[PDB]
CSV table of C-alpha atoms in Angstrom, one decimal:
chain,number,residue,atom,x,y,z
A,6,UNK,CA,12.0,8.5,10.7
A,7,UNK,CA,10.8,9.7,7.6
A,8,UNK,CA,7.2,9.4,5.1
A,9,UNK,CA,8.6,8.8,1.7
A,10,UNK,CA,5.2,9.1,-0.9
A,11,UNK,CA,6.2,7.3,-4.3
A,12,UNK,CA,4.6,8.1,-7.5
A,13,UNK,CA,0.9,7.7,-8.0
A,14,UNK,CA,-1.7,9.8,-10.0
A,15,UNK,CA,-2.5,13.4,-9.8
A,16,UNK,CA,-5.3,15.3,-11.9
A,17,UNK,CA,-3.5,15.1,-14.9
A,18,UNK,CA,-0.6,12.8,-15.3
A,19,UNK,CA,0.8,9.3,-13.8
A,20,UNK,CA,3.6,10.6,-12.3
A,21,UNK,CA,7.5,9.6,-11.2
A,22,UNK,CA,8.2,12.0,-8.4
A,23,UNK,CA,8.9,11.3,-4.7
A,24,UNK,CA,8.7,13.0,-1.7
A,25,UNK,CA,9.4,12.6,2.2
A,26,UNK,CA,7.8,14.0,5.2
A,27,UNK,CA,9.9,14.7,8.2
A,28,UNK,CA,6.7,15.1,11.5
A,29,UNK,CA,9.7,17.1,13.1
A,30,UNK,CA,9.4,20.3,10.8
A,31,UNK,CA,5.6,19.2,9.1
A,32,UNK,CA,7.5,19.9,5.7
A,33,UNK,CA,7.7,17.8,2.6
A,34,UNK,CA,10.7,17.8,0.4
A,35,UNK,CA,11.0,16.6,-3.4
A,36,UNK,CA,13.8,14.1,-3.9
A,37,UNK,CA,14.9,11.7,-6.8
A,38,UNK,CA,12.2,10.6,-8.9
A,39,UNK,CA,11.4,7.3,-9.9
A,40,UNK,CA,12.9,6.0,-13.4
A,41,UNK,CA,9.3,5.3,-14.6
A,42,UNK,CA,6.1,6.7,-13.6
A,43,UNK,CA,4.2,4.3,-11.5
A,44,UNK,CA,0.4,4.6,-10.0
A,45,UNK,CA,-1.1,1.9,-8.0
A,46,UNK,CA,2.6,1.1,-6.8
A,47,UNK,CA,3.4,-1.4,-4.0
A,48,UNK,CA,6.3,0.2,-1.6
A,49,UNK,CA,7.9,-1.1,1.0
A,50,UNK,CA,11.5,-0.8,3.2
A,51,UNK,CA,14.1,-3.5,3.0
A,52,UNK,CA,17.7,-3.3,4.5
A,53,UNK,CA,17.9,0.7,4.2
A,54,UNK,CA,16.0,0.8,0.9
A,55,UNK,CA,13.1,1.6,-0.4
A,56,UNK,CA,11.3,-1.1,-2.8
A,57,UNK,CA,9.2,0.3,-5.8
A,58,UNK,CA,7.3,-2.3,-7.2
A,59,UNK,CA,5.3,-2.6,-10.2
A,60,UNK,CA,2.6,0.1,-11.2
A,61,UNK,CA,1.0,2.1,-14.3
A,62,UNK,CA,3.2,4.3,-16.5
A,63,UNK,CA,0.5,5.7,-18.6
A,64,UNK,CA,1.7,3.7,-21.4
A,65,UNK,CA,1.5,-0.1,-19.5
A,66,UNK,CA,1.4,-1.9,-16.2
A,67,UNK,CA,4.5,-2.3,-15.3
A,68,UNK,CA,6.8,-5.7,-14.3
A,69,UNK,CA,10.1,-3.7,-13.4
A,70,UNK,CA,10.9,-2.9,-9.5
A,71,UNK,CA,13.3,-0.1,-8.7
A,72,UNK,CA,15.2,0.5,-5.3
A,73,UNK,CA,15.8,3.3,-3.5
A,74,UNK,CA,19.0,4.3,-1.3
A,75,UNK,CA,18.5,7.2,0.5
A,76,UNK,CA,22.5,7.9,1.3
A,77,UNK,CA,22.7,8.7,-3.0
A,78,UNK,CA,19.7,10.2,-3.5
A,79,UNK,CA,19.3,7.5,-6.6
A,80,UNK,CA,16.5,5.0,-7.8
A,81,UNK,CA,18.0,1.9,-9.7
A,82,UNK,CA,16.0,-1.1,-11.2
A,83,UNK,CA,16.2,-4.7,-10.2
A,84,UNK,CA,14.9,-8.2,-11.5
A,85,UNK,CA,11.3,-7.5,-12.5
A,86,UNK,CA,8.4,-9.5,-11.4
A,87,UNK,CA,7.3,-12.5,-12.9
A,88,UNK,CA,4.4,-10.8,-14.3
A,89,UNK,CA,2.8,-7.1,-14.5
A,90,UNK,CA,1.3,-5.7,-11.4
A,91,UNK,CA,-1.0,-2.7,-10.8
A,92,UNK,CA,-2.4,-2.2,-7.6
A,93,UNK,CA,-0.4,-4.3,-5.9
A,94,UNK,CA,-0.3,-5.1,-2.4
A,95,UNK,CA,3.5,-5.5,-0.7
A,96,UNK,CA,5.5,-6.5,2.6
A,97,UNK,CA,8.1,-7.5,4.2
A,98,UNK,CA,8.7,-10.7,6.2
B,6,UNK,CA,-0.7,-6.1,17.0
B,7,UNK,CA,-3.4,-4.5,15.6
B,8,UNK,CA,-4.2,-3.9,11.5
B,9,UNK,CA,-5.9,-1.1,9.9
B,10,UNK,CA,-7.8,-0.9,7.1
B,11,UNK,CA,-8.2,3.0,5.9
B,12,UNK,CA,-10.6,3.6,3.8
B,13,UNK,CA,-10.9,2.6,0.3
B,14,UNK,CA,-14.1,2.0,-2.1
B,15,UNK,CA,-17.0,-0.6,-2.0
B,16,UNK,CA,-19.4,-1.1,-4.5
B,17,UNK,CA,-21.0,2.2,-3.3
B,18,UNK,CA,-19.3,5.2,-2.2
B,19,UNK,CA,-14.6,6.1,-1.3
B,20,UNK,CA,-15.0,5.6,2.5
B,21,UNK,CA,-13.4,8.1,5.2
B,22,UNK,CA,-14.2,4.8,7.4
B,23,UNK,CA,-11.3,2.9,9.1
B,24,UNK,CA,-11.7,-0.5,11.0
B,25,UNK,CA,-8.9,-2.5,13.1
B,26,UNK,CA,-8.3,-6.2,13.2
B,27,UNK,CA,-7.4,-7.9,16.5
B,28,UNK,CA,-5.7,-11.0,15.4
B,29,UNK,CA,-6.4,-12.0,19.4
B,30,UNK,CA,-9.8,-12.5,18.7
B,31,UNK,CA,-10.5,-12.0,14.8
B,32,UNK,CA,-12.9,-9.2,14.8
B,33,UNK,CA,-12.6,-5.8,12.9
B,34,UNK,CA,-14.3,-2.8,14.8
B,35,UNK,CA,-14.8,0.4,13.4
B,36,UNK,CA,-13.1,3.6,15.1
B,37,UNK,CA,-12.6,7.2,13.9
B,38,UNK,CA,-13.2,8.0,10.2
B,39,UNK,CA,-10.7,9.7,8.5
B,40,UNK,CA,-11.4,13.6,7.7
B,41,UNK,CA,-12.1,12.8,4.1
B,42,UNK,CA,-13.2,9.8,1.9
B,43,UNK,CA,-9.9,8.4,0.5
B,44,UNK,CA,-9.5,5.6,-2.1
B,45,UNK,CA,-5.8,4.9,-3.4
B,46,UNK,CA,-4.4,5.9,-0.6
B,47,UNK,CA,-1.0,5.7,1.1
B,48,UNK,CA,-0.7,4.4,4.7
B,49,UNK,CA,2.2,4.6,6.9
B,50,UNK,CA,2.9,4.1,10.6
B,51,UNK,CA,5.4,6.5,12.5
B,52,UNK,CA,6.2,7.5,15.9
B,53,UNK,CA,2.8,5.4,16.9
B,54,UNK,CA,0.6,7.8,14.6
B,55,UNK,CA,-0.9,6.2,11.5
B,56,UNK,CA,-0.7,8.7,8.5
B,57,UNK,CA,-2.9,8.4,5.7
B,58,UNK,CA,-1.6,10.1,2.5
B,59,UNK,CA,-3.1,11.5,-1.2
B,60,UNK,CA,-5.9,9.0,-2.1
B,61,UNK,CA,-8.9,10.1,-3.7
B,62,UNK,CA,-12.4,11.4,-2.1
B,63,UNK,CA,-15.0,11.1,-5.4
B,64,UNK,CA,-14.8,15.0,-6.1
B,65,UNK,CA,-10.5,15.0,-6.2
B,66,UNK,CA,-7.4,13.4,-6.6
B,67,UNK,CA,-6.1,14.6,-3.2
B,68,UNK,CA,-2.7,16.2,-1.8
B,69,UNK,CA,-3.9,15.9,1.8
B,70,UNK,CA,-2.3,14.4,4.4
B,71,UNK,CA,-3.9,13.0,8.1
B,72,UNK,CA,-2.7,11.3,11.1
B,73,UNK,CA,-4.2,9.4,13.7
B,74,UNK,CA,-3.5,9.1,16.9
B,75,UNK,CA,-4.9,5.3,18.4
B,76,UNK,CA,-5.0,6.8,22.1
B,77,UNK,CA,-7.3,9.7,21.1
B,78,UNK,CA,-9.3,8.2,18.4
B,79,UNK,CA,-8.9,10.8,16.0
B,80,UNK,CA,-7.5,11.7,12.9
B,81,UNK,CA,-5.6,15.3,12.4
B,82,UNK,CA,-4.7,17.2,8.9
B,83,UNK,CA,-0.9,18.1,8.8
B,84,UNK,CA,0.9,19.4,6.1
B,85,UNK,CA,-0.5,18.6,2.6
B,86,UNK,CA,1.9,16.6,-0.4
B,87,UNK,CA,3.4,19.1,-3.3
B,88,UNK,CA,1.1,17.1,-5.6
B,89,UNK,CA,-2.1,15.7,-5.5
B,90,UNK,CA,-1.2,11.9,-5.4
B,91,UNK,CA,-3.7,9.0,-6.0
B,92,UNK,CA,-2.6,5.1,-6.1
B,93,UNK,CA,0.6,6.5,-4.1
B,94,UNK,CA,3.0,3.8,-2.1
B,95,UNK,CA,4.2,5.1,1.4
B,96,UNK,CA,6.9,4.1,3.5
B,97,UNK,CA,8.7,4.9,6.8
B,98,UNK,CA,12.3,5.0,6.2
C,6,UNK,CA,13.5,-10.4,4.6
C,7,UNK,CA,11.7,-11.0,1.6
C,8,UNK,CA,9.5,-8.8,-0.1
C,9,UNK,CA,6.4,-10.4,-0.7
C,10,UNK,CA,3.9,-8.6,-3.9
C,11,UNK,CA,0.4,-10.2,-3.4
C,12,UNK,CA,-2.1,-9.9,-6.3
C,13,UNK,CA,-2.7,-6.7,-8.6
C,14,UNK,CA,-3.6,-6.1,-12.4
C,15,UNK,CA,-1.8,-7.7,-15.0
C,16,UNK,CA,-2.7,-6.1,-18.8
C,17,UNK,CA,-5.4,-9.0,-19.1
C,18,UNK,CA,-6.3,-10.1,-15.9
C,19,UNK,CA,-6.7,-9.3,-11.7
C,20,UNK,CA,-4.4,-11.5,-10.1
C,21,UNK,CA,-4.7,-14.3,-7.0
C,22,UNK,CA,-0.5,-15.1,-7.8
C,23,UNK,CA,2.0,-14.0,-5.0
C,24,UNK,CA,5.7,-13.8,-5.4
C,25,UNK,CA,8.6,-13.0,-3.2
C,26,UNK,CA,11.7,-10.9,-3.8
C,27,UNK,CA,14.9,-12.5,-2.5
C,28,UNK,CA,17.6,-9.4,-2.9
C,29,UNK,CA,20.5,-11.8,-1.6
C,30,UNK,CA,19.9,-13.1,-5.2
C,31,UNK,CA,18.0,-10.3,-6.7
C,32,UNK,CA,15.7,-13.0,-7.9
C,33,UNK,CA,11.9,-13.3,-7.5
C,34,UNK,CA,10.1,-16.6,-7.2
C,35,UNK,CA,5.8,-17.0,-7.1
C,36,UNK,CA,4.9,-19.0,-4.4
C,37,UNK,CA,1.1,-20.0,-3.0
C,38,UNK,CA,-1.7,-17.9,-4.6
C,39,UNK,CA,-4.1,-15.8,-3.0
C,40,UNK,CA,-8.1,-18.2,-2.5
C,41,UNK,CA,-9.3,-14.5,-4.5
C,42,UNK,CA,-8.3,-12.3,-7.2
C,43,UNK,CA,-7.0,-8.7,-5.4
C,44,UNK,CA,-6.4,-5.7,-7.1
C,45,UNK,CA,-6.0,-2.5,-5.1
C,46,UNK,CA,-5.4,-4.9,-1.9
C,47,UNK,CA,-3.8,-3.8,1.7
C,48,UNK,CA,-1.4,-6.2,2.8
C,49,UNK,CA,0.6,-6.1,6.0
C,50,UNK,CA,3.1,-8.3,8.5
C,51,UNK,CA,1.8,-9.1,11.3
C,52,UNK,CA,2.9,-12.3,14.2
C,53,UNK,CA,5.0,-13.6,11.3
C,54,UNK,CA,2.2,-13.7,9.0
C,55,UNK,CA,1.2,-12.1,5.7
C,56,UNK,CA,-3.0,-10.6,5.8
C,57,UNK,CA,-4.0,-9.5,2.2
C,58,UNK,CA,-7.2,-7.3,3.0
C,59,UNK,CA,-10.2,-6.0,0.4
C,60,UNK,CA,-9.2,-5.6,-3.7
C,61,UNK,CA,-11.3,-6.5,-6.4
C,62,UNK,CA,-11.8,-9.7,-8.1
C,63,UNK,CA,-12.9,-8.9,-11.7
C,64,UNK,CA,-16.2,-9.6,-10.3
C,65,UNK,CA,-16.9,-7.5,-6.9
C,66,UNK,CA,-15.2,-5.2,-4.5
C,67,UNK,CA,-14.3,-7.3,-1.8
C,68,UNK,CA,-14.6,-7.4,2.2
C,69,UNK,CA,-12.7,-10.7,2.3
C,70,UNK,CA,-9.1,-11.0,4.1
C,71,UNK,CA,-6.7,-13.5,4.1
C,72,UNK,CA,-3.5,-14.6,5.9
C,73,UNK,CA,-0.3,-16.2,4.4
C,74,UNK,CA,1.9,-18.7,6.9
C,75,UNK,CA,5.4,-18.7,5.1
C,76,UNK,CA,6.1,-21.8,7.1
C,77,UNK,CA,3.4,-23.5,5.4
C,78,UNK,CA,3.0,-21.4,2.3
C,79,UNK,CA,-0.5,-21.4,2.4
C,80,UNK,CA,-3.6,-18.8,2.8
C,81,UNK,CA,-6.2,-19.0,5.0
C,82,UNK,CA,-9.4,-16.6,5.1
C,83,UNK,CA,-10.3,-15.3,8.3
C,84,UNK,CA,-12.7,-12.3,9.5
C,85,UNK,CA,-14.0,-10.4,6.8
C,86,UNK,CA,-13.6,-6.1,6.8
C,87,UNK,CA,-17.7,-4.6,8.2
C,88,UNK,CA,-17.5,-3.1,4.4
C,89,UNK,CA,-16.3,-4.0,1.2
C,90,UNK,CA,-13.2,-2.4,0.5
C,91,UNK,CA,-10.7,-2.0,-2.6
C,92,UNK,CA,-7.8,1.1,-2.9
C,93,UNK,CA,-7.6,0.3,0.9
C,94,UNK,CA,-4.8,1.7,3.3
C,95,UNK,CA,-3.3,-0.7,5.8
C,96,UNK,CA,-0.8,-1.0,8.3
C,97,UNK,CA,-0.4,-2.2,11.6
C,98,UNK,CA,0.4,-0.2,14.8
């Protein structure tokens, strides 16, 4: 029941930070950041984990993928994509 | 059972417009626009509302967030992110 | 139970390729590509299909929309948006 906002680009850097919105309280709070800065990142939820797929870290388009476990507040890197992808769409089916 | 397309960038302006697709009829129709133009916007659905998170309005990267109620066809602004984020990934967990 | 990564931009071209992640095996595999290269594409899942909405193909911002049927491994084009939209957010409600 939370909305997670993962990465992106502010007016100054590509972001590794992640924040979560609680609609009951109308508040966002920062949680554990990604391993890598990622804008243009695709995000999906599968088996209670949040996957962050691809993006751009300021230095290169990314093929890496990492998964967030809310029960532990940590991200871990998993198998990368076949190709670097920023501006990627992600869905779970 | 509708697909909402929120904001974006055409070949001429960043967009505040929003349109909804009905697969039964293979048609898109325009609904109420966002308060702000937003490309690179993250969108998620929680408690029957559509949240539009961050993006870019042509003038600045955005920390603002707004929520759409389909029963009223209106968007309203809620608490902003801690940081401006365009190219942000959003998921609900 | 798979995560699909649709389109995007590598360090060399806008992408029509699509790959699917199986968390049980920690592997991605390439499936049928989109009709069009699409970065900045919005993706959502409705009635067992994956919709790819808008984006950019290297030549132009896109109003086209296509839908993937995993049982047939094919994409087909459906009704386009009213407006070209890349950097578009997409959700299903």
